[PDB]
Structure 1
Amino acid sequence: MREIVHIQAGQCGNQIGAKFWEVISDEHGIDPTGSYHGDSDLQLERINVYYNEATGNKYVPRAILVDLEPGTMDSVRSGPFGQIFRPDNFVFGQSGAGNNWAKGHYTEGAELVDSVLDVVRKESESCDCLQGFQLTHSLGGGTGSGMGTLLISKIREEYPDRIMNTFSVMPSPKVSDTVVEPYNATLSVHQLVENTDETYCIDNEALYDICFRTLKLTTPTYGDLNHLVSATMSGVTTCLRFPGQLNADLRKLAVNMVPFPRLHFFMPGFAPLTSLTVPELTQQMFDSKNMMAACDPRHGRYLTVAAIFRGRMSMKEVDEQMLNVQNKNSSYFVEWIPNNVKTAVCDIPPRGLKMSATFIGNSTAIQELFKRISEQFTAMFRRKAFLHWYTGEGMDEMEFTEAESNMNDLVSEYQQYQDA
């Protein structure tokens, strides 16, 4: 199990995804033209996980760029590393999805999905042993949300035994483009609950607050939020991208982080986030301010945690400090999953830092995220507000009732394990 197929859909999924390939291309020593110029062989050992090797010693991201309108893709092609993607791996239409999940899922997106699946199959067929798929997208718009979840369904149908992993940006009223975001997100969460194995939940308000309250950026842009996401995505994929103590792939991750199939929505975090020591990395990576789901972990309990340290540092002080925090936060870890906190280390630090830490928590506190979405959804749905945008695409109110009912069920299942 080596190759991962990456998919990025819609404006948000494509802008975060572009940044992700920029960051990991740097780490692995690939330049904007796909040529390797690295000082270490740790960089090439697991390069095939994310890059196809072409003739001429070039490495091409195993990446598929999807959108229902051309703008963001054009931006990407003109971007820093735009020329590194396979040109025939851009798949886009002209109409757009109007921030409308029904257009992404059922109409506009349905017209385009087969050609996306052609490229997916072409990337999969040239895999020695496909691990699975990683999708980047937002849940609040139309393409990444509606078409993204459509893609996931059709990938599951064609590759039912592969791991499906998403980086899903969750809308917040504080950092919002349209009022329909709660509708699009409630509809998508229903899909994610049934069809992914691992979903990193990234809350745009959490990203904003980190940029504004902690990093002291007077006026964050989406670019500032996306720099945080790409840093975190580099962190959570370190163990896939570099050798180490662990034999780490997407399946071992799901087996160890997901005790019940539906509870697979992780809170990620990054450290340091300050405006230099191991105890500093460790204290930060465990407080709410470094987490990206806008959920207070102290309001719930961790079922499982994965922590990945990067840089030269004392493994002894690492293990020592991890074991310390588990007593400061003794009550916030469930007692019926022994040894549910896994530490991994990588020697290679991210650019611009001597050391760093990425946190992946499966905490019952993430129920707060789905509660917020559910309340916003219900405030509008009780009055059927904005629904004509969806009924106009052939959808029926009952599909909204079922999505709301499924998400409220999800909330109740988290609460069940928080009292166990």
Structure 2
Amino acid sequence: REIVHIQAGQCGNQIGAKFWEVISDEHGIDPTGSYHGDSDLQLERINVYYNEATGNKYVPRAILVDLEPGTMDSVRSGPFGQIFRPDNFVFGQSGAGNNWAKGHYTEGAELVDSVLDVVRKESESCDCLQGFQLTHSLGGGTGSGMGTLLISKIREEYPDRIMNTFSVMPSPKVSDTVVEPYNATLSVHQLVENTDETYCIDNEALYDICFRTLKLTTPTYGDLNHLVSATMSGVTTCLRFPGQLNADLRKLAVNMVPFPRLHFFMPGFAPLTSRGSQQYRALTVPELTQQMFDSKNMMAACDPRHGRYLTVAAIFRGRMSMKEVDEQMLNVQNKNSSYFVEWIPNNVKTAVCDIPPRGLKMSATFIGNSTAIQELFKRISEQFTAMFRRKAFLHWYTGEGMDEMEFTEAESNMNDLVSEYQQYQDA
């Protein structure tokens, strides 16, 4: 069951590269593409993400996309820059100017067919393609605008495949431009309709974690991407290593998505660590379970106590007592049963994987579908409305052919999504 990976825009390519860097190390693949590991667990399902090449070389099934060559040139000169298939580098020259319209309708529409040629070339090599995963931000132009354009066209050509995304949400605390709420709202509209699974990665939460918890006075994007790569590794563990639970993208979707539009997940992770800062003390299982559920460990700036969990997927990594894990997992549900919907019996599922990530002897990754996620979309909607009520900064969009009505629809659909999440919070 092969997965085709796509990374779009500056953010998309910067976390996308970091992702391939991290899991390549876990699968024992060096920058050359050669395997140098000591466990056979590493190679059993390496076909999910890697293509097998001459000399038993492994090549990521990854497609790199951008409307400017800057970031992708940095990727190609980065640590694992050479592992990527050079033909899978598809880039324009004009950029998107943090403009959704440019990415979706003009600049990106010019490039999108070239990208789909590569997607198609990769897909036909697959014995049994299960689907796609996209990494991108929603606050810019390329990843947000062209990324959702790609999603729409992939769904057209592969309507029976799963679409998955890692979507970075914009935050004023970590902001490039004022129009990020516009770009994000337009994108969420697209995501609600055309993805089955979306990991909501909030730059607000990533900032707060770095500041409040990791005590980083002034966090960079590099710091923020330490958390993202750690989270991305964890939520894909069940897909990359042998196991019985949530092993493919469809079975994850069937277990996590009770209603088709409500497919926006809160990722969580424990223990939280900063770059370089060495951890010497391994956490106990009770500690991992408590932390991975705490709001301070959520990658989406939402209070889980303000909502209810529809579904939960948990993945413990390392050498530990699987009996202690099940005990602690059952304790959380039994002590805080109110925060789990009673009309989905046994909605918490747990997996365990012997291989821990690098630098930690054990870890836990959390994937929650909570109604509390509405707080994320409400926040975006408020920032959106503040500007839109005065039609501020809209000329950037009307200049590319967009009409005000399209903003109104996007606004309305996100507010509908909010109310849908609220409907089940009071069930």
With normalisation by structure 2, the TM-score equals: 0.97
Look up the match of 2:157. 158
Percent identical among aligned pairs is 100
Q: Distance in 1 between matches of 2:212 and 2:194?
A: 35
Name the CA distance, whole Å, in 1 between partners of 2:244 and 2:319.
15
SS of the equivalent of 1:413 reads helix
Counterparts of 2:8 and 2:392, CA distance in 1:
27
Please say which of residues 245-254 and 31-40 is displaced more in the overlay: 245-254
Range with greater deviation from structure 2 (207-216 or 361-370): 207-216
Q: How far apart in 2 are the matches of 1:218 and 1:314?
A: 37
Q: For residue 326 of structure 2, what is the aligned residue in structure 1?
A: 319
**Inter-partner Cα distance in structure 2 for 1:247 and 1:237:** 9
Match of 1:261, SS state, is coil
1:331-355, Cα deviation, whole Å (9 max, x unpaired): 1000000000000000000000000
Contact 2:210/2:219 (<8 A) preserved: yes
Q: CA deviation at 1:327?
A: 2.3
CA deviations over 1:141-168 (Å, ceiling 9, x no partner): 0000000000000000000000000000
Matched ranges for 1:8-407 at <5 A = 8-246=7-245, 248-273=247-272, 276-407=283-414
Shift of 1:247: 6.1
Q: In 2, distance between residues paired with 1:318 and 1:60? A: 35
Contact (CA 8 Å) 1:101, 1:146: kept in 2 or not?
A: yes
Alpha-carbon distance between aligned partners in 2 of 1:258 and 1:297, rounded to the nearest angstrom: 17
Q: Is the 8 A contact 1:4 1:132 kept in 2?
A: yes
Equivalent residues of 2:103, 2:142 under 8 A apart: yes
What's the offset of the Cα at 1:273?
1.2
Deviations 1:63-93 (A, max 9, x none): 0000000000000000000000000100000
Give aligned pairs, total: 419
Q: Shift in Å at residue 244 of structure 1? A: 2.3
More divergent stretch after superposition (237-246 vs 23-32): 237-246
Residue 278 (structure 2) aligns with: none
In structure 1, how many angstroms separate the alpha carbons of the residues matched to 2:107 and 2:416? 30
* Unpaired runs of at least 5, structure 1: none
Secondary structure of the 1:227 match is: helix
Determine if contact 1:49/1:241 at 8 Å carries over to the other structure: yes
Kindly indicate whether the alpha-carbon contact (under 8 Å) linking 2:88 and 2:118 is maintained by their aligned counterparts in 1.
yes
The 1-side partners of 2:407 and 2:366 are apart by 34
Aligned partner of residue 164 in structure 1, secondary structure: strand
SS at match of 1:32: coil
Greater mean alpha carbon deviation, residues 193-202 or residues 215-224: 215-224
- 3-state SS in 2 of match to 1:117: helix
Cα distance between partner residues in 2 of 1:346 and 1:371:
36
More deviation in 307-316 or 321-330?
321-330
- Contact 1:3–1:49, Cα closer than 8 Å, also in 2: yes
Output the CA distance in 2 between the equivalents of 1:148 and 1:261. Answer: 20
Per residue, is there more helix in 1 or in 2? 1
Partners in 1 of 2:341 and 2:254 — Cα distance?
A: 17
Deviation, 1:263, is: 0.1
Quote the Cα distance in structure 2 between the aligned partners of 1:11 and 1:237. Answer: 22
**Structure 1 counterpart SS, 2:255:** helix
Q: Per-residue deviation at 1:246?
A: 2.8
Describe the superposition over 1:84-136 as per-residue Cα deviations: whole angstroms up to 9, x where unpaired. Answer: 00001000000000000000000000000000000000000100000100000
Do the aligned residues in 2 keep the contact of 1:91 with 1:116 (CA within 8 Å)? yes
Q: Aligned partners of 2:33 and 2:218: how far apart in 1? A: 34
Q: Name the stretch that deviates more: 295-304 or 247-256.
A: 247-256
Q: Is the 8 A contact 2:133 2:164 kept in 1?
A: yes
- CA distance, structure 1, for counterparts of residue 223 and residue 246 of structure 2: 33
CA distance in 2, matches of 1:120, 1:110: 16
SS of residue in 1 equivalent to 2:110 = helix
* Higher mean C-alpha displacement, 244-253 vs 360-369: 244-253
- Cα pair distance change 1:247/1:14, threshold 3 Å: closer
Per-residue deviation, 1:49: 0.3
Deviations, residues 261-283 of structure 1 (Å, cap 9, x unaligned): 00000000110115910001000
**Larger mean Cα displacement after TM superposition, 91-100 or 319-328:** 319-328
Q: Distance in 2 between matches of 1:374 and 1:127?
A: 40
SS in 1 for 2:416: helix
Deviates more, 1:242-251 or 1:66-75: 242-251
Q: 2:101, 2:141 within 8 Å by CA — same for their partners in 1?
A: yes
CA contact (8 A) 2:356 2:362 kept: yes
Give the secondary-structure state (helix, strand or coil) at the position aligned to 1:111.
coil
Cα deviation, residue 226, structure 1: 0.7
How far off is 1:291 after superposition?
0.3
For the Cα contact (< 8 Å) 1:245–1:345, is it kept in 2?
no
Give 3-state SS (helix, strand or coil) of 2:109's partner.
Answer: helix
SS of the equivalent of 1:131 reads: strand
Q: Distance in 1 between matches of 2:243 and 2:286?
A: 22
Aligned partners of 1:223 and 1:108: how far apart in 2? 28
Query: Do the aligned residues in 1 keep the contact of 2:318 with 2:353 (CA within 8 Å)?
Result: yes
1: distance between equivalents of 2:196 and 2:34?
33
Show the counterpart of 2:2: 3
What do the CA deviations read for 1:230-261 (whole angstroms, capped 9, x no partner)? Answer: 11000000000001243610000000100000
Instruction: Give distance in 2, aligned partners of 1:210 and 1:125.
Output: 42
Answer yes or no: is the 8 Å Cα contact 1:76–1:82 preserved in 2: yes
Bigger mean CA deviation after superposition, 320-329 or 387-396 = 320-329
How far did 1:218 drift?
A: 1.7
The 8 Å contact of residues 203 and 292 in structure 1, kept in 2 or not, is answered as: yes
**Unaligned 5+ residue runs, structure 2?**
274-281
Paired position in structure 1 for 2:279: none
Contact 2:246 2:252 in 1 (8 A): no
* Deviation by residue 1:29-84 (Cα, 9 ceiling, x = unmatched): 00001000011100000000000001111000000000000000000000000000
Deviating above 4 A after TM superposition, structure 1's stretches of 4 or more consecutive aligned residues are: none
TM superposition shift of 1:328: 2.6
Q: Deviations 1:306-340 (Å, cap 9, x if unpaired)?
A: 00000000000000000011123221000000000
